[PDB]
RNA sequence: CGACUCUUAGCGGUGGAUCACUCGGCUCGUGCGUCGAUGAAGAACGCAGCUAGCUGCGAGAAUUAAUGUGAAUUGCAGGACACAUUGAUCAUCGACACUUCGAACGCACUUGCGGCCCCGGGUUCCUCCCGGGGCUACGCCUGUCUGAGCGUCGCU
RNA sequence: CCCCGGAGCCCCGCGGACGCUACGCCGCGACGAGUAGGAGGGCCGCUGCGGUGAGCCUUGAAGCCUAGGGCGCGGGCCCGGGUGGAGCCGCCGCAGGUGCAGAUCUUGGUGGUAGUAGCAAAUAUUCAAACGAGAACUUUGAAGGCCGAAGUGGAGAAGGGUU
RNA sequence: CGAAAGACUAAUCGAACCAUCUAGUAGCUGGUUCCCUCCGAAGUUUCCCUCAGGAUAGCUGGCGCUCUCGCACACGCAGUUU
RNA sequence: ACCCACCCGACCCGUCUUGAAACACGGACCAAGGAGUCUAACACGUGCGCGAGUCGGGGGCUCGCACGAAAGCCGCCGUGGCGCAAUGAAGGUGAAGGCCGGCGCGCUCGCCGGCCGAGGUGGGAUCCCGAGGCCUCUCCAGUCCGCCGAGGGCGCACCACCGGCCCGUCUCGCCCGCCGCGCCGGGGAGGUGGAGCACGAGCGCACGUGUUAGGACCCGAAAGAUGGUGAACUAUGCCUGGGC
RNA sequence: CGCGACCUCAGAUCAGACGUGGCGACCCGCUGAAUUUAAGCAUAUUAGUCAGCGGAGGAGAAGAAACUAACCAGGAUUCCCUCAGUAACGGCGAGUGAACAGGGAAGAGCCCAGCGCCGAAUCCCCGCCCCGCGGCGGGGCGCGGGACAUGUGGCGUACGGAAGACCCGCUCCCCGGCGCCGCUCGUGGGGGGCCCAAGUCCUUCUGAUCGAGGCCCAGCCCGUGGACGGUGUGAGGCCGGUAGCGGCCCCCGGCGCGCCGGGCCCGGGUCUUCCCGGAGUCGGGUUGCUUGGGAAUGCAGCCCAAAGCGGGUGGUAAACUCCAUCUAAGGCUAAAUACCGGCACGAGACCGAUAGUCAACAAGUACCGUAAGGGAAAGUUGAAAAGAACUUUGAAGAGAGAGUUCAAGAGGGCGUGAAACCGUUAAGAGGUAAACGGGUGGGGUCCGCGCAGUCCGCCCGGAGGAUUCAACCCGGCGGCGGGUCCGGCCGUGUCGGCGGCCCGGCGGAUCUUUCCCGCGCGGGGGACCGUCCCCCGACCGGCGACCGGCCGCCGCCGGGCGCAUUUCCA
């Protein structure tokens, strides 16, 4: 909000005496506008009590490995098909999940294939349900250029533009990243995990280059590694009912004692 | 999207673009479609619409297959009169009634030297176009 | 007023400090700026180094730095002298000459006077005009490079 | 039941909250970075067929020319134009034009008084008189012309 | 002295809820004032952003109103009907100029007071007519009165600026 | 400015008015916006140009941790008494 | 949930106050507005990443930014910050001890070989060993499985205590060293000051509370300062007119 | 008593030039408070900050060491990060507070006076010709004026310079024009103009659609274009645009080639002989301000007032002494840097008409004030004005009918139309002001019923009626699970191959310069170590990591089975 804004008045208070209310009045005048109210956050006028600042604190940074940490959990949600339909994504009828494609489709120049092969790799019907999110905005945003809203859509892995953005562009719900220039933003959007990709064999011979396998270091992000596992066996109910650990337990009390 | 980056998909810049755009540009804004007919023979999509063009209104109330002679353009208010479009006020008097360029369709239009050259301006782009794209 | 514990602690908000806040919402914009610019040097000065001229090796001062080694601002007159390069020319081949330099030791002139040469070694001089005099260098080590270099010119390695 | 008063609801008033709109703001950024005695900014007074205000312009006054555009402008009139023609209407703007105050300049601020050169009526240079035109601020530099001094000399 | 793909089961170690959003579900006890103040939880509420609801919406959005039907301890919420006429919401995250009875608070509006106070300085009006929809007040005529030439008369200055 | 009353200086005078420094300072008035739940005070200490305020102890809450054993198998502590 | 009736209960809120229904202030009524904010610095708590490190800025390389003024990468990856060492005003100094054997007279002092290597007491969650049971449809043999376990051990963290080491300082003492033998340098014993060491815990990011500096919860002075406008009222002087 | 030089001074409406005011976000020079903090206050602080005056530019200022340092030394200025809330200052309280180094952004260096040499070799203005002329210039020609020796120009300035002799190697740089060629990065520089994809297809809602299903061919078309706006609701395809190394036309820039006109005989080293520095300034004393600068950081006034192996600095006053380091008292200079004013654009987790600028509107307007100055309120009919013809009552405003509109329950201050408050209509009540809490009653309003609500669901028994099964085999498909791990793929731990090791790469302060290349160092090999990969065998976790057969079981389809069955229905 302006500096100036709502200080331009010059008023002083007509001090105590005068029946009204100490508030600094505008001084002088034969307008509505005198004796007023000037200043005051509560007054008509009036200035907004702690006028917004420029200098308040908009960006905010964060540790390089804990950002290469969320990009790799994103991706290993990629993977996942329950955490990719969760996100939404219909991704009932696709051949494979880390779904990765020939590299001719660095190639295409035209929506027409880019559209055609989403519709081969049945991919299509995303495409298909970001037409049908497209709805108009709720509220203020509308008269401020974000009129309209829809869908997130397939991701697009890609390794070199060859003439592949410009296929995939109006497509409604694609995004396009570089393998080389990866995005947590884009990777998962609402900070939400799973995301329906379609690689380039290209850009997915990469990614272990990118970030490095666990017994072999990044070799392209100088000084990384994949994070280690806290814990290995995630299921628990595989480790529950185990031989050796139901070996070890008193048989469990169950009766329920009523008052 | 747009990406050169001096254009504006600003509702309030474009709209103010709009209501206060100047004669020879609003002529521009005004266009409408030729008839499939003349888009067969002249390679054109639509014309900046004129004095006295044969039209028919497409949409509406005066939604019609008759073939009305325009009347005026009246720029400013963005609309067009035309011939049979009308309606009788309280008093008995025809009131031409306004039609928007867009909401209408040129069966024929008023060929001078000046709309010609312009035809021939468009259709050769066209066809540039085309040849670019083989 | 303090309560149990804490730096008693002086801060400078005291003048209108407010008045002077120097934002830096610029920076994005700057560095572009910058970039674009750098892009643009480049290109006018078409196959000469990016980087600039040659620039000396130098000792930093004091005991702490001391053992570092940097760039220093340009090549002291001695160093020129015995190397042979007339010190008014060094600066038309991209030579940096500063001449305030003295020079204290003979283990940093030496050096220093290697470097020239070296650089003169691996220098391509262009004839003035196309037609070829003495000095302008072959049109096989011409063709096959009309290239700028990259980075720093010859860079020092500590 | 009666009038009156209180309460609730219906409908109508008063009033302009709410909601929905937004040719306006606020903030951040980019590029450029240009006023004036060849009269600036600012002010004044003017100018439309009907026009008060805002805007736009300057006695060529809602504008002239030119170039681009290519049929309007339009509240009503009237008109033009042949829109197979430099051609309506907009835009641009390189030519032209630009009343009076204002650093503001003949001197004054009454809008008053002048001087000096030339031109038309007036004369037949007879000065008057009237009208038109061009000069007439201060400071300062380079030169120019006229000079001043028991300032320093020379010759007579 | 035998096997539960069959002992038939009050206990079953062969497999295990109707139950198991494990931030879930269930059982036993105890206890419950509260200013200033502190902490927790709010599927309480407002506005905007990333996600997400193949959400809703001219076969009627928001708002508004409702002696209609309900839910919640409560913040609040949901449905019916009316009105309205173009946008709007649920969930997961993020963000804040986020919740009013008070401030002789600010701006706008409205009452009671009230058809009340009040329309009392400087003696004065009456009759007829005309116009006119309409006359206590206009105009004309007649009468009765006043200012009483230091004027309630006749002319300027300043000021107003078309009166 | 005053034949003096601190009179008058554009309804303002024991220091005019206008704009700014200025959102001047305030140990002092006033106000300070939704629900449930749980815990729940102090007005006493010493120091202070301190006595309508601070500081510091005290009294409150929150976060915990370390251990204890009703899982037939307990050590320590108390606004008591012996 | 609308209205009415009746019995019982029941003073008007806000606020300052030991005490408010008060003859204490604010409040006719309704709508909208309206006050703990943001920045910086510190501290503690919590969450995440990495960990004797950590770090990202600032800069640079990758794009016309649609989304990007993002995202990514950097022998800059570390100039540098903080951290990994203190203590002294400073010149400066700077965290090891033990044991064993030998050689100097073992002189609780000086020098040479070997071994262990962050001391010890008490309490310590927890692990470990475990006599012994306690049965099995018989009399004994007898491996397997438990359940408990008297008794005994290693003892984390943490606490209390005693030792030790480093710097400052004092007191008392006796020896070593060499390019410079000196108003040179080095050590020992015993106290005592240190925000110390005694097998590391930090760094960055985020949220919360508190405390400050800032307009700093919102409203409020009397004043103070700078630069300008007024003598059309009125005060006094002067000029030129009028009047009694 | 003249005339003539010069010197110092006047006057010209003398000829020709310039300066004056504005703007002020940023910038340079002065000037300079007080609120405030210190819980009082006077030093301090607020602050070299507001106000005041001056002067600029597209930036300004600064800047080529009288510098840092004390090192093995760096090397103009500006800017950022750091130094550092540090050294220091301070009623040593409140508080205040730099610099060097180090890493970056950028990078660029120069000229006089003097000292000297050169016939003033220089400059300005006149006038005549040729070119060029909208940034007054070139070339030539004039006994045409003047400036200038009280010093103009070339050489030259501390990084040394000059003049000499011989060592060497050889000779393009600039401008005034006139042309002409390649349109020269947002991927054709800048400006202007004018252009360029695809449905108003079906049906159906609607006042109007832009909405909803649909559109065999793989999916209506286009899609380098699904930004945005407009158009009677919500539009990739109606229109303007949007995309594109898309098009054409203008103009202008910038750089490439040719010709002419001029200028321009422009080096380096080596040895010798010469040459060399800014005075009322430094420095001191002082007083006042200023600084973190402390026995004086910087600026001032006043007084004193220099030197030349001098002078200045070397963060504690002075003397002696060595070292180090610059060279002051003259000047110019792009760049990274700043920008709440201007012109022109772009964007937003901002505001949405009591907000956001005072100002969405005929706003610095109306209005006030003598004046300096103060300073508002105020957006919205509808898709379209279709803005209510006509009839009638009234003097008229106002009505009543009629009409327009999807609607006037949108009627020109008109979208929606809350509350306070008022009118009425309906209902109910009424001597302790009203209102309230708890508890019942009565009446209303609607809401759910029921014209029996006897509510359903399993299983069973009986009684009626109707289709094909289930059970079973047979054929096919699919699924599960299993072990023989049977056969093969798959991968963990271990061992064997030293096998990838050079046909496996990186890393290393491990080594070697027997190596190679480039100049003891750099790069590359070559050893070595660490790490990552092939070959087969063996053991083991045989792991949700899979295949193939076989087995068992399940399910579906079709075959079989016609009816004591298995269904449906009442
Ligand atoms: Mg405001
Ligand atoms: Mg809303
Ligand atoms: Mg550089
Ligand atoms: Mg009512
Ligand atoms: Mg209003
Ligand atoms: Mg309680
Ligand atoms: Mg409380
Ligand atoms: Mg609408
Ligand atoms: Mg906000
Ligand atoms: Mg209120
Ligand atoms: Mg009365
Ligand atoms: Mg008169
Ligand atoms: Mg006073
Ligand atoms: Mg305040
Ligand atoms: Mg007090
Ligand atoms: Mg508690
Ligand atoms: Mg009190
Ligand atoms: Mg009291
Ligand atoms: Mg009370
Ligand atoms: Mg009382
Ligand atoms: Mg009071
Ligand atoms: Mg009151
Ligand atoms: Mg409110
Ligand atoms: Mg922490
Ligand atoms: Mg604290
Ligand atoms: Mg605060
Ligand atoms: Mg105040
Ligand atoms: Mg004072
Ligand atoms: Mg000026
Ligand atoms: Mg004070
Ligand atoms: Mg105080
Ligand atoms: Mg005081
Ligand atoms: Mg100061
Ligand atoms: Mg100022
Ligand atoms: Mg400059
Ligand atoms: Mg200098
Ligand atoms: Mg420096
Ligand atoms: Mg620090
Ligand atoms: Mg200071
Ligand atoms: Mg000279
Ligand atoms: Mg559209
Ligand atoms: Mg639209
Ligand atoms: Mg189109
Ligand atoms: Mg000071
Ligand atoms: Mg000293
Ligand atoms: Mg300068
Ligand atoms: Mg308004
Ligand atoms: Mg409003
Ligand atoms: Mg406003
Ligand atoms: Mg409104
Ligand atoms: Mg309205
Ligand atoms: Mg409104
Ligand atoms: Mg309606
Ligand atoms: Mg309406
Ligand atoms: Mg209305
Ligand atoms: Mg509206
Ligand atoms: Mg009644």
Not at chain 2, 39 to 55: A, G, L
Not at chain 2, 57 to 77: A, F, L, S, W
Not at chain 3, 78 to 91: D, Q, S, T
């Amino acid at each position: 909000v302006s500096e100036l804004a709502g200080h331009q008045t010059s008023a002083e208070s007509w001090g105590t005496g005068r029946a009204v209310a100490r508030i600094p009045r505008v001084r002088g005048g034969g307008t509505h506008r005198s004796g007023q109210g000037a200043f005051g956050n509560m007054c008509r006028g009036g200035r907004m009590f702690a006028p917004t600042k420029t200098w308040r604190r908009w960006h905010r940074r964060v540790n390089t490995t804990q950002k290469r940490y969320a990009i790799c959990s994103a991706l290993a949600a990629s993977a996942l098909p329950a955490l990719v339909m969760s996100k939404g994504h219909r991704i009932e009828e696709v051949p494979e999940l880390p779904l990765v494609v020939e590299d001719k489709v660095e190639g295409y120049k035209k929506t027409k294939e880019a559209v055609l092969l989403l519709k081969k790799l049945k991919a299509w019907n995303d495409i298909k349900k970001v037409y049908a999110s497209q709805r108009m905005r709720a509220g203020k945003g509308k008269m401020r250029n974000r009129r309209r809203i829809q869908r997130r859509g397939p991701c697009v892995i890609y390794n070199e533009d060859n003439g592949i953005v410009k296929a995939f562009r109006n497509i409604p719900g694609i995004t396009l990243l570089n393998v080389t220039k990866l995005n947590i933003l884009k990777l998962a959007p609402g900070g939400h995990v799973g995301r329906f990709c379609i690689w380039t064999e290209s850009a997915f011979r990469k990614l272990d280059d990118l970030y490095g396998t666990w017994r072999k270091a990044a070799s392209l992000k100088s000084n990384y590694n994949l994070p280690m596992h806290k814990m290995l066996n995630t299921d628990l109910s595989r480790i529950l009912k185990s031989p050796e650990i139901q070996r070890a337990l008193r048989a469990p009390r169950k009766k329920i004692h009523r008052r | 999207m747009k990406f050169n980056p001096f254009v504006t998909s600003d509702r309030s810049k474009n709209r103010k673009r709009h209501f206060n755009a100047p004669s020879h540009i609003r002529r521009k804004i005004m266009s409408s479609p030729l008839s499939k007919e003349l888009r067969q023979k002249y390679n054109v999509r639509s014309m900046p619409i004129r004095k006295d063009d044969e039209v028919q209104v497409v949409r509406g109330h005066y939604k019609g297959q008759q073939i009305g002679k325009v009347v005026q353009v009246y720029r400013k208010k963005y609309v067009i009169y035309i011939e049979r479009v009308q309606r009788e006020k309280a008093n008995g008097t025809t009131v031409h009634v306004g039609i928007h360029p867009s909401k209408v369709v040129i069966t024929r239009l008023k060929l001078d030297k000046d709309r010609k050259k312009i035809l021939e301006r468009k259709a050769k782009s066209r066809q540039v176009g085309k040849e670019k794209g083989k | 007023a303090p309560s149990r514990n804490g730096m008693i602690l002086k801060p400078h908000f005291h003048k209108d400090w407010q008045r002077r806040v120097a934002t830096w919402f610029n920076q994005p914009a700057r560095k572009i700026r910058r970039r674009k610019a750098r892009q643009a040097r480049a290109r006018r000065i078409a196959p000469r180094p990016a980087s600039g001229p040659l620039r000396p090796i130098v000792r930093c001062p004091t005991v702490r730095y001391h053992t570092k080694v940097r760039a220093g601002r340009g090549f002291s007159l001695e160093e020129l002298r015995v190397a042979g390069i007339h010190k008014k020319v060094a600066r038309t081949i991209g030579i940096s000459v500063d001449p305030r330099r003295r020079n204290k030791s003979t283990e940093s002139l030496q050096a220093n006077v290697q470097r020239l040469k070296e650089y003169r070694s691996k220098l391509v001089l262009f004839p003035r005009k196309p037609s070829a005099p003495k000095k302008g260098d072959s049109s096989a080590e011409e063709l096959k490079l009309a290239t700028q270099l990259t980075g720093p010119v010859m860079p020092i390695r500590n």
